[PDB]
Amino acid sequence: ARAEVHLRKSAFDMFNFLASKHRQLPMPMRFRHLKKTSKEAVGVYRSPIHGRGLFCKRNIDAGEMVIEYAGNVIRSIQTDKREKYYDSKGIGCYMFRIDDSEVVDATMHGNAARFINHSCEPNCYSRVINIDGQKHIVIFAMRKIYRGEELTYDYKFPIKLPCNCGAKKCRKFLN
C-alpha cells in the first residue's frame, strides 16, 4: 500500500500478455492448411501449468495435422553467443534443436508456437516430414482436443529447470 515493499521483483519477461482471465490424402499438397485454416482452432491465453499457453476453443481429433513450427534456424556455433545473450537479457532455453547441427532459435525471430509448455502428462507428440525437399515439423494428434485445454508435447529428454505442472506422473523436471 505504497508504504510496504512487496517481493517477487525480478521478472525477465518478454511476451507481456500475462492475464488472470484466460477466457478461452497425399503428403505434399497439405501446405495450404498450414497457412490459411490454422488460425482459429487455438487461442492464446494464460496457461495454468507455467507461464503463458495456447488454450483451445475448438476440437481436433487423432491423426490430424495441426501446426508447423518455424523460427530462426541457425547452426551450432551461434549457440555459444546465443546462450550468453540468453543469460544477459534473461532469455529462456529456446534452443529448439531439431538436430545437433541446426537449432531453431526463438529469441530474435519465431512463430506463435513459442508459447508452449512442458509436462510429463502431455496431449500431443512431435513428428517431422519433408515437403519439396525441405524438412518441416508438423504435429499429428493422438486424441481429441476439448474446449478449454492447452497444447503440450513431451520433450522426450532422457533422465536445473524444474517442470512444475502438478500432474501425478509429472517427473518435476525435463527428464
Binding site: 490424402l25 497425399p26 505434399p28 499438397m29
Partner: protein
C-alpha cells in the same frame, strides 16, 4: 476495329453475340448481354484454371492432365455444389477410405 478490347476482357464478344442471336433464345437482345456473358465466362474459366495450375505444380508436371482438373473440381465445395451431376472422362476419383474400416493393433 475490334470489340473485345473495349472492356479489356479476353473471351470474344462478337462471337457470343452472333451465337446467341442465331441460338433463337429470344428475338431481340440488348447491348450489355454479350459483354456480360463474356465476363462471367472469363471469371469461371479463371477460377477453374487457377486450381488446375496449382494441381499441375503439385506433382511437378508442366502439362495439366484431366486428373488434375478432376481433383481441383472435386476437392472444392462450391464447385461440387454447382457441378453436382457431372462426370469427367478419364477423371478418376479422389482417394477416400471409410473411418471405421481402419485396422490397428499394438
Amino acid at each position: 476495329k475490334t470489340r473485345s478490347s473495349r472492356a479489356g476482357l479476353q473471351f470474344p464478344v462478337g462471337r457470343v453475340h452472333r451465337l446467341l442471336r442465331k441460338g433463337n433464345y429470344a428475338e431481340r437482345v440488348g447491348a450489355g448481354a454479350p459483354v456480360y456473358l463474356a465476363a462471367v465466362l472469363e471469371y469461371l474459366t479463371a477460377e477453374i484454371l487457377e486450381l488446375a495450375g496449382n494441381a499441375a505444380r503439385d506433382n511437378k508436371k508442366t502439362r495439366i492432365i484431366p486428373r488434375h482438373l478432376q481433383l481441383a473440381v472435386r476437392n472444392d465445395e462450391e464447385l461440387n455444389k454447382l457441378l453436382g451431376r457431372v462426370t469427367i472422362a478419364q477423371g478418376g476419383v479422389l482417394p477416400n477410405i471409410q473411418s471405421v474400416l481402419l485396422p490397428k493393433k499394438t
